[PDB]
Design a protein around this ligand. Sequence first.
Ligand SMILES: [Ca+2]
Ligand code: NA
Length: 269
Amino acid sequence: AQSVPWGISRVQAPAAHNRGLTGSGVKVAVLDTGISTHPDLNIRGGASFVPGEPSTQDGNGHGTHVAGTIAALNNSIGVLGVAPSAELYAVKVLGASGSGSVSSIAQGLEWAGNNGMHVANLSLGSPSPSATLEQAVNSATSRGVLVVAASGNSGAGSISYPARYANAMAVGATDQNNNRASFSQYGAGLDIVAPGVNVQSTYPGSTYASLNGTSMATPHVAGAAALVKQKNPSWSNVQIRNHLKNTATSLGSTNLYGSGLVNAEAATR
Ligand SMILES: [Ca+2]
Ligand code: NA
C-alpha cells in the first residue's frame, strides 16, 4: 500500500496531482549524499563531485530521503512525492558522513546549470560565507536554475549558507501545528517554510525512514516548484519562486516564516 506522508498532504500536493500536474518534464537536481536506486524512485542521471567516488548511489541515506519527498513515485507502494513525475538527477556533493565542501557544492551547482536543470535542491548548509558558493548560486541562476536551499537546524535567528544568498530560495521547517519547528533557522533571507518534522520518505536498501530537519522541508518546495514549472513551462526561476511565495499560506512574521507555508494547490490554480 502507498501512504501519503503528512507533509505531502499539508502542502496540498494531491490536489495538484488531481489536476494532472506531477512535475513531468521538469529536471530536478538533488545536491546531496547521492540517491540510491529504490522501487519508489526513478533516477534519470547525475554526477558525483565527491573525491574518489564515481557512483551517485547514496552512501548515507539523506539524499535518498530528500529525493523521495520531491518525487517518490505515485503507485501502490511506499510514499508519494510532491512531484511524482519529476526527473531526478543525483548530484553527489556530500560524502557518506554528510560533510561537504564549498568546492563540491559549487561544482554541483555549476553542473546543474550546464545540464539544464530547472530546480536544484540543496538540503545542506555551510555556517560561513563563501564567494565561490555565492558565485556558483548566481551562475546556476543565470543559466536558468531555481536554487532551493535549507535554512539550517541550529535554532538561530540567522540562516545558513547558501540559503542566505539572495539567489537561493531559503526554506525553513514547520511542525504539525503549522508552527516553526524549534530547530528551524530564521531571519534575514528566509523565503518560505514547509513540513520538516517526522517526515517519512524513501531510504536505501528499499526501506523508508522518518527524519526531522530543514533538509526535509526544502524538497517540499523543490517539488512544488516542479509542479508550477509543468503548468507554466515558459516561466523563469524567479517567476516560479515568487509565485510560490505569493500563494503560500501566511503563518505570521516574515522574519520567522518568510511568506509562510508552501501551498501546491494554490500555486497551480
Ligand atoms: Ca509510491
Ligand atoms: Na536566499
